[PDB]
Amino acid sequence: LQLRPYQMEVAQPALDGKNIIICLPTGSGKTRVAVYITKDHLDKKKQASESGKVIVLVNKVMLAEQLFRKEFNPYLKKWYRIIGLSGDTQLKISFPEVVKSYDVIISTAQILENSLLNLESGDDDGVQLSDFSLIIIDECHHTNKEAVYNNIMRRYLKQKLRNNDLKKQNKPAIPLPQILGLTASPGVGAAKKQSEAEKHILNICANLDAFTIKTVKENLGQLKHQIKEPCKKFVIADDTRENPFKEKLLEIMASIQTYCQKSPMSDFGTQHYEQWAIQMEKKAAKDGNRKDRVCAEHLRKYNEALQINDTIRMIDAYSHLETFYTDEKEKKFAVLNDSSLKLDETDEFLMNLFFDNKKMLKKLAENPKYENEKLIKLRNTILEQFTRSEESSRGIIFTKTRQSTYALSQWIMENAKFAEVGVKAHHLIGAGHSSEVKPMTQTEQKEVISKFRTGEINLLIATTVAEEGLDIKECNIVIRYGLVTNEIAMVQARGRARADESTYVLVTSSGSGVTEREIVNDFREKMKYKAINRVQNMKPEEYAHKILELQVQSILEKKMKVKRSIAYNDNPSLITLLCKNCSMLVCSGENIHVIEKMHHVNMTPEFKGLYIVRENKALQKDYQTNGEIICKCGQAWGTMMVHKGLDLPCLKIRNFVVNFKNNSPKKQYKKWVELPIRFPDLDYSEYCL
RNA sequence: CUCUCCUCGGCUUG
RNA sequence: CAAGCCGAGGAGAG
Ligand SMILES: Nc1ncnc2c1ncn2[C@@H]1O[C@H](COP(=O)(O)OP(=O)(O)OP(=O)(O)O)[C@@H](O)[C@H]1O
Ligand SMILES: [Mg+2]
Ligand SMILES: [Zn+2]
């Protein structure tokens, strides 16, 4: 209900009706400022008998929910009507009625965007920006290129230009709401010189139509005393050992290569080799040549294994391979569980090649002689920190992959010194279904976060999920285990580490170029500060001139870009689908039907006798609903689906080859919307009757 | 510009 | 809780 001086100085120009940005360090009370400004605004508008409505825009669901239940509601509920929305609520069915019924709204941006689109073209009630008096935008550094924020603000700018034109013509001009942007750092984008940094800052200030940036400039000592920085630290590891396991893997890779007469220029264990193998597999699949597709797939797996070993334990790589080969065997035998049998020689060669050295690999992976230097350094760091504390320490470890989070959690649990010192660890990952690994659910995220808040969990092992938008208590140790993304993320993760006598550690090796990337980000930071300091002291007139120029340019460039998006012949029966591996006719483009313009199915009797059903592994670890579909050759095709009480198969296009009847330059597409032909809706007149 | 990794949102069938 | 659809951003390699 009250503010501190360094908050009030940045707040004032907004209390006067100017639209601005506010950059403040992580954890220094931006949300408080937002609430206070909201209250003052509403009161001040109520004095003069005017309409006052405030809308708050976020980009995450959890963030809306949390800010409503915890910050905005318990301070203004006593005077005003508050509501919060998202896609997880049912309140979204009538957004206008919500608009008129409540004063303060909290929401994700795409809701508003959809309503605006409805008004623009649809037949629905629709909403317009004029209906609001104040718009707050959290994490305003996302207002760029094609983000949803920027579409909204483009509408705003177009209205402003239209008002400028009306000013000399008929009056009055349409009124527009005040804008308030909050952030921690606007960043530098892709900048290589100071001038480009200035340019970027001005672009951000233009997209939001801001009067100033308004950073803290006076009470630096108080702020520094309140929020104190950690001590930055590097840790480097060097090795010239760990030979046997890696050498055996390399030998197997070479043996596989000499069986198909394919040697690339790139070396083993890099992204270049992975790219080469993917290209090779794609081409073989297109041509229909087996014995090259499969070898390429297996080579990709082995390269992944090497990459894994480079970062974590050997046994993780061993398991990566074991799982794959076990599954392949199970698929082949579930196939052969049916009724003379003809095998494939190359598949057998690969299977035997793995199973002949399995035991030797398992034996080599278990050897404390050569574990990993990075893991050793990490253990030392953790133990030092947690022993020095006397049970008063929390910590975060930022990793790159999901599998690495799981693996580090297991590695920590298998050793007893950690448990001795008071270490309780848990993993945290994202929720999207495109990452080789089954995601975590929002509910589980919430639970993990809560238990970290209370104290049941001491340290987290996370991907970039935890950089922004999560309510996390102050930590004593932040560690980056071979990860460097950008300057904004660096600022955020470093601001995690409050709780005085804290440190910020980066662990890595000597060969990679991670250290240099960190150093370059450190340079970019001071570039940014200098540019901001200049833009603050620019003369108002030229400032406005540049801002206007940039806005016009933005609108015009978007116009030109949209001109071309206007632009696919429909010939369903024309194409046929072939299996990648066992190239053979599977179906024609006339039997494929579409449910609700989303789900691609095939309901024909002769297709039911072409595939096999497996069980659901996600549910395996009861019942089985969406079981996987495989061909006889062992290639996956899709899954099972239920509609109107009927069981149906759903197909994934990335598993097939498309063959036309005109010229037959075969192709792959990776998703349905790229295939230029159309399909018909479902009809019960067919398939029976 | 391509490929991979990572994150987010809106929406359907059960 | 499972499956599917569409869009957006960031990093790296080539
Ligand atoms: N005026 C104030 N009076 C009392 N406490 C305050 C005030 N301002 C900030 N705080 C303290 O700061 C915390 C809230 O900070 P807040 O999380 O809003 O910072 P932030 O800028 O939102 O950081 P983040 O980037 O995590 O959102 C509260 O726990 C509260 O105790
Ligand atoms: Mg905040
Ligand atoms: Zn097949």
Numbering used by the authors: 307 to 645, 666 to 893, 896 to 949, 953 to 1020
Task: Quote the study that presented this structure, word for word.
The highest-resolution structure, with an overall resolution of 2.8 Å and local resolutions up to 2.7 Å, was obtained from ATP-bound filaments. With a helical rise of 44 Å, the asymmetric unit spans 14 bp of dsRNA with a protein–RNA interface area of 2168 Å2 similar to WT ATP-bound filaments. The most notable difference in the ATP-bound M854K structure is that the mutant Lys854 side chain forms a salt bridge with Glu813 in Hel2, and a hydrogen bond with Ser491 in Hel1, within the same MDA5 protomer. These polar bonds are more constrained in distance and orientation than the weak hydrophobic contacts formed by the Met854 sidechain in WT MDA5. Hence, the polar contacts with the Ser491 and Glu813 side chains both contribute to inhibiting ATP hydrolysis by M854K MDA5, and contact with either of these side chains is sufficient to prevent ATP turnover.
Long cytosolic double-stranded RNA (dsRNA) is recognized by MDA5. MDA5 cooperatively assembles into helical filaments on uninterrupted RNA duplexes longer than a few hundred base pairs (bp). The helicase consists of two RecA-like domains, Hel1 and Hel2, and an insert domain, Hel2i, all of which form contacts with phosphate and ribose moieties of both RNA strands. The helicase and CTD, linked by a pair of α-helices referred to as the pincer domain, form a ring around the RNA.
